[PDB]
Design brief:
- The protein is an alpha/beta fold and 309 residues long.
- It has one domain: TIM Barrel.
- The chain has 10 helices and 12 strands.
- Strands 1-2-5-6-7-8-9-10 form an 8-stranded parallel beta barrel, surrounded by 5 helices. A two-stranded antiparallel ribbon has the order 3-4. The protein has a two-stranded antiparallel ribbon with strand order 11-12.
- Helix 3 crosses helix 4 and helix 8 runs parallel beside helix 10.
- The protein starts with a strand and ends with a helix.
- The protein binds the ligand COc1ccccc1-c1noc2nc(C)[nH]c(=O)c12.
- The site of the ligand COc1ccccc1-c1noc2nc(C)[nH]c(=O)c12 has 11 residues, from loops.
- Belongs to the glycosyl hydrolase 18 family. Chitinase class III subfamily.
- This is Endochitinase A1.
- It is found in: Cell membrane; Secreted, Cell wall.
- It is classed as hydrolase.
- The entry lists the keywords plant-type, inhibition, hydrolase.
């Protein structure tokens, strides 16, 4: 039913508003808040959106240079277009670079979520901190934690929910991007102990359980069945599960991209098998989709057709 895509790390990517105009996209995850407070300058989080933003950064009130970008003008301009078009825009935390970020304590997990809520959530009279996207309010937060284990993330999720519940008139969302092996070293703890709305399983780069292994069963064993089972047991039991795929041949490691016809064979099986739990498709990522035109349309448009068929 829904199609989610990452944007922000594509080489020479088009600006976000280009993807705000793409009807087929339902959810866009903007990557990334990639530096975490415990190990970053000023103890502020830091951000990177590839070729976007003017390169300026915030300083702390004592003059310490942070890694949080302060001139993301096109992003600020573009998010409201996405939302006007009915898309959900989630700010993604983590991403694969750098490899050395984690959360060291319960207190800092809570403080990280508090900061992000203040900086990127609803505008509040009592916040005197940075507003990197101005008066824009994101639709929630994606946990793309790719290194260093699982500590802290459940606490962050729970903290965000407490905050969401103070704004009962607006819906916000939380998501996670585990890889396919169960247990997932970064996110099984958060999925077991806290409640995500969406979970997109990355079904590329691990041979044991990839989407490609549905097509060629000699490679591995595609394990969406196992993920349904593990979720029914978790605090995330009401999450919808998405199949995460590369949007071109070069978006991930060699051998993990599926043709539209291959995706249709997988999705038809699994959407039929799990009509309530199967949420849709997630794509890595917007620029690879856009650059992979098939019969005059980007890969993402072909994915939505499969989902609606
Ligand atoms: C290890 O793979 C990566 C290294 C650096 C930057 C991005 C990736 C990456 N490849 O597929 C991905 N998929 C997700 C959800 N997040 C990522 O960071 C990546």
């Amino acid at each position: 039913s829904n199609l989610a895509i990452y944007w922000g790390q594509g080489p020479n990517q088009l600006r976000l508003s280009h993807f705000c105009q793409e009807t087929s996209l339902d959810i866009i995850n903007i990557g990334f808040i990639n530096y975490f407070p415990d190990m970053s300058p000023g103890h502020w989080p830091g951000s990177n959106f590839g070729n976007q933003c003017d390169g300026s950064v915030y300083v702390t009130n004592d003059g310490v240079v942070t890694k949080l970008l302060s001139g993301c003008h096109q992003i600020m301009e573009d998010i409201p277009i996405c939302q006007a078009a009915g898309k959900k825009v989630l700010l993604s935390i983590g991403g694969a670079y750098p490899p050395d970020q984690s959360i060291l304590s319960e207190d800092s997990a809570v403080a990280f979520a508090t900061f992000l809520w203040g900086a990127f959530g609803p505008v509040a009279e009592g916040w005197e901190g940075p507003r990197p996207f101005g008066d824009v309010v994101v639709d929630g937060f994606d946990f793309d934690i790719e290194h260093n284990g699982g500590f802290g993330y459940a606490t962050m999720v729970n903290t965000f929910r407490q905050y969401f519940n103070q704004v009962p008139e607006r819906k916000f969302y939380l998501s996670a991007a585990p890889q396919c092996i169960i247990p997932d070293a970064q996110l099984s703890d958060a999925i077991f102990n806290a409640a995500f709305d969406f979970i997109w399983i990355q079904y590329y780069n691990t041979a044991a359980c990839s989407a490609k292994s549905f097509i060629d069963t000699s490679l591995g064993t595609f394990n969406f069945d196992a993920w349904v089972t593990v979720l029914k047991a978790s605090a995330s039991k009401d999450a919808k599960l998405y199949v995460g795929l590369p949007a071109s041949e070069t978006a991930a490691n060699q051998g993990y991209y599926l043709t539209p016809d291959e995706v249709e064979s997988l999705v038809s099986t699994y959407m039929d098998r799990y009509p309530d739990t199967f949420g849709g498709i997630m794509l890595w990522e917007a620029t690879a989709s856009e650059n992979n035109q098939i019969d005059g349309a980007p890969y993402a448009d072909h994915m939505k057709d499969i989902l609606l068929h």
